[PDB]
Design a binder for this molecule. Structure first.
Ligand SMILES: [Ca+2]
Ligand SMILES: [Ca+2]
Ligand SMILES: [Ca+2]
Ligand SMILES: [Ca+2]
Ligand SMILES: [Ca+2]
Ligand SMILES: [Ca+2]
Lengths: 332, 104, 113, 332, 332, 104
């Protein structure tokens, strides 16, 4: 037998040492991570918290996320136990950022200087700019529309169909939660459970990373990171920035260099909050490396940590929209 | 009302050749066709009903087939060639109309 | 493994059209469609078109819209190519091939001198 | 005993190797698929997912679909475990399609070219054109009418009787779900359960194929296909295009050639979405066969896959109605 | 012990081979059908489905129908397990039929010709003609009146008493279902259960036969018939037209000839729908008998089958009312 | 429609040097490239489809690679140097356009 203290359906020893799901003959079953057999088939090693039913505090458990016993509308990026699965809803409108400070100094200063005079205000409240509801998150909204009915708002989909039909401080009032039933494949929406009772936990226990590498659109992803103060948060597996980027934004390295659709990691700029920059700078000083891009594999992530990653070749503004770029790139 | 016609009314001399006695009706038939055997002015009786299955009192050498408007009865191994008229009756609707043919 | 055996030689009168044949016994003819391609000097190799034997449906190149007509006969399991308005520019070797261009026939090498 | 991990009432070994239902003396019982005994009596081999209670994610299970312990209003086409059972409701009106691109090029180009400049926009939202509610699906709607009371709307039936009594973007707001009770033959409608909580799962886990071979009417059928990304979706049996057509639209082959009421498969034209065309083209290139009609038995179906099949002899428009045809066919 | 897979309270072997209920000393108990003892006392052999709690899909089970543990308002004609027990409600008004085609040809043509140019449109929706609610069915309506309160509408009874107090497309909106309790003789009406959730199943699984042999009134009775497509429907016992008439309309044969109150079966005319006529004609051609009246014992009944039986000596109209008759019969 | 061009059409004399036969198309190709071998006016057949995998009837010494617009086939150990034209065919869209090359 196995202890499985978290009662997630996965043995805690497997959740610690690493585990993966493989199918032999159309039948799924968990197995401890074994090299030279699971790696060659593209299976991803999964690490979870042995004392948490859900590592990212989202309503879906580690077993449901990994084995596929989850709502099929959940984005594949959230199938990792260490990636939060929560909805983000919005309404020539585009996604916006609360405030930005970096931009007055050199764009290449992030290689040698981290934090200090550069920062970015982060607010968990949804916001948008103008000059139709869209779910840019990884979880659905079922029965309640937000404030700026049986149909849902699937992620990466608009509430009205495309064929059908200066700030907007959209509120985070979401609907109930669709929880997968264990006795049968049927999925039911628990009226008592609400998203508004789950979002605060995800915000507290996860580190938020925002990326705009595709279509110049800000995608909000959160990774379950370790908080040393809380003993339960320590049970989470160690998370590095390289691994967080690989499991959240689809970053891949074929030869030790992070790439995103052919774009190298050095092509992007890193922004941090006040506390995030202080923690990152402390880690850099302890590791004797002012440069951060080349030490990404040895930089640990903590809770209440916010990281903003932009594109260097585009010129940004206070609201984080690529209003302009360099002369060479716009010409060709 | 439903006129019954045969694609071939007289069989030319063709030894060791494919044999098929076909019937083309005025309109489509939902396989309600009957096949009739008769000796020389005697032994008048049917062999196949519903165009596929035998009367169960006759040997399996008779075999009918077809679908839609054209239905053909084939002979596996012919044993004799005499003057004996055949009949081709549909059963879709009144009145009952017969056909004709010359085999065996 | 697949081989196509044709006539060793053919005698024709001057300025007389000729038809090229290629047997397709190496596979099920009615299953895989057969393409036609020709190689000419100063223009490399240009695709002519393809024929689907089961229904006779064809697709032709923009250059070969009316240059050639492709048909087939299931009786002997072969396909035929007919060329109209023959001219000096039409003198080029044509080799047929199965779907995906996996199997190629043995096109003749015409030489006048 | 048998494992039956999915708890569907069918052994998982039977669900993998194939199974069928036969009656000896007015009594039904499952049996593993055995050739030369079950094939001659017309019984159809059934394959299901060993880890899913319902393979197609519809509220009816594999056991209920096969053994007949299902609501009798469900269309016989949905009795297969691999065919989804969900309602489609609409209102000289006729069914319409969102958008069409194919038609400018040759009608016979599908034999040698797949995708590229030809595609078709697909939207799961119901739509109709004009110049009365009709259920063209395979599942009933019981207590709630859609937005453009005890009686139901049976499939292939109008909400008012025939004796009784330019776009219509009908919404997918359906009613509750009539679930067959296991303790007795009585059927009861679960108020808590709703169709709107089941339709999204079916859309995500099934591949939609639209056919217009009868009465020039677009019928919407979905087949449970394998999604490699999700481990649970991999448990579904391998599905080919030939088998999907045979089990959904009634296609039959007496001599290796697919026919529909005497019409050969080559008489129909194949249309695909952008992702569908890319996947189909990848499979064709891997299999070394540009032609698709003759490799239908070796073309696998995946999730989120949309295929549109039309009639070649009819001329279609942007809304997919046979406005005209060839001169020869209209003359005779 | 006995298997009793259907959990109806009757052994499945008894339900297959036949069974009957007899009383020895004021005590009821089931017994397998034994000839020369049960036949002489007038007991009727009962056959049911071994895999169905209720053979006719009506809310009453086989045990309740046979043993008398049923609501006493249920008509005795519905006490047979193979006869559906569902209400029919209506309002010089009289019962009407949707449409009729037979009548232009000879009245005696049914002896030699079946189907083709003769048919009759059938609709399950209630209808009536004019120039007060009446229950012509076999089951009661308790708490909800239909659309064109504690008292009920008993079958063969008017909603108002007789002493008390051009089409009417009455809807099938009935009330709840009175289910007999097993722990005690008390009968209770289940609010959750509704007739509208049971009527569709009865329509799908039973064959409807309409008769007008008494008072020239159309009585609607349905008999549970075998559907070959559905494996569960195959579990029903084989039903012939002769047996269906005997168990539904009270037809009796003392010397091998069907009679109804002294009227021979040949005195009535048979009408069928399109599918019904096609199936009947196929059976007649297979059995080598164009005549149907003399092969009634070897004609099987299937699901979704509608049969209309009228009186030959009366002249009928499109609405199926005996507007006139022959000169001889009206004179005497 | 999709013009096919080769970065190198003639190979200069370079003994024991890196070998790469590249093809640059008019637009991007989703790895729908075919490689064709042919002896002296004989033995015309393909070797690699989808730019990566072999025909399975040919030895593994042939190995193609590439991504995007440029695809290059490399030779591990050359054994002969004769006059034999090569072909470079794309399969993205109609019509099928070939290429060229000189190796082996
Ligand atoms: Ca655990
Ligand atoms: Ca865990
Ligand atoms: Ca199972
Ligand atoms: Ca299953
Ligand atoms: Ca029983
Ligand atoms: Ca029973």
């Amino acid at each position: 037998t196995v202890p499985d203290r978290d009662n997630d359906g996965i043995p805690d020893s497997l959740e610690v040492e690493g585990y993966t799901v493989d199918v032999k003959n159309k039948r799924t079953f968990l197995s401890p991570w074994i090299s030279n057999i699971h790696e060659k088939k593209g299976l991803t090693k999964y690490k979870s918290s042995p004392e948490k039913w859900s590592t990212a505090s989202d309503p879906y458990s580690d077993f449901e996320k990994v084995t596929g016993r989850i709502d099929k509308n959940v984005s594949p990026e959230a199938r990792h136990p260490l990636v939060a699965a929560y909805p983000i809803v919005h309404v020539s409108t585009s996604r916006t950022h609360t405030s930005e400070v970096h931009g007055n100094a050199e764009v290449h200063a992030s290689f040698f200087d981290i934090g200090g005079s550069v920062s970015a205000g982060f607010s968990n409240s949804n916001s948008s700019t103008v000059a139709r509801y869209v779910n840019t998150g990884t979880a659905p909204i079922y029965n309640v529309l937000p404030t700026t009915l049986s149909q849902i708002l699937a992620p990466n989909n608009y509430y009205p169909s495309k064929n059908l039909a200066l700030r907007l401080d959209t509120d985070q009032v979401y609907g109930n939660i669709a929880t997968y039933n264990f006795e049968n494949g049927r999925v039911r929406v628990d009226t008592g459970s609400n998203w508004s009772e789950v979002l605060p936990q995800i915000q507290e226990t996860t580190a938020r990373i925002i990326f705009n590498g595709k279509d110049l659109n800000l995608v909000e992803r959160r990774i379950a990171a370790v908080n040393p103060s809380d003993p339960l948060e320590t049970t989470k597996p160690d998370m590095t920035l390289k691994e967080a980027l690989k499991i959240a934004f689809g970053f891949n390295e074929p030869n030790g260099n992070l790439q995103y659709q052919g774009k190298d990691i050095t092509e992007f700029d890193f922004n941090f909050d006040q506390q995030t920059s202080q923690n990152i700078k402390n880690q850099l000083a302890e590791l004797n490396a002012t440069n951060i891009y080349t030490v990404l594999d040895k930089i640990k992530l903590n809770a209440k940590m916010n990281i903003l990653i932009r594109d260097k070749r585009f010129h940004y503004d206070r609201n984080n929209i690529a209003v302009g770029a360099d002369e060479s790139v716009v010409k060709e | 009302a439903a006129a019954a016609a045969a694609a071939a009314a007289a069989a030319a001399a063709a030894a060791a050749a494919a044999a098929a006695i076909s019937c083309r009706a005025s309109q489509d038939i939902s396989n309600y066709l009957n096949w009739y055997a008769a000796a020389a002015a005697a032994a008048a009786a049917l062999l196949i009903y519903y165009t596929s299955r035998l009367h169960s009192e006759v040997p399996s050498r008779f075999s009918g087939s077809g679908s839609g408007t054209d239905y053909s009865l084939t002979i596996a191994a012919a044993a004799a060639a005499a003057a004996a008229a055949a009949f081709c009756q549909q059963g879709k609707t009144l009145p009952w109309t017969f056909g004709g043919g010359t085999k065996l | 493994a697949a081989a196509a055996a044709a006539a060793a030689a053919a005698a024709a009168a001057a300025a007389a059209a000729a038809a090229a044949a290629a047997k397709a016994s190496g596979y099920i003819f009615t299953n895989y469609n057969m393409h036609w391609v020709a190689a000419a000097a100063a223009a490399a190799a240009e695709w002519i078109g393809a024929i689907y034997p089961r229904t006779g449906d064809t697709s032709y190149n923009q250059k070969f819209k009316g240059k050639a007509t492709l048909t087939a006969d299931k009786s002997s399991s072969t396909a035929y190519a007919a060329a109209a308005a023959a001219a000096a520019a039409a003198a080029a070797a044509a080799a047929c091939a199965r779907d995906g261009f996996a199997y190629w026939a043995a096109a003749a090498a015409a030489a006048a001198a």
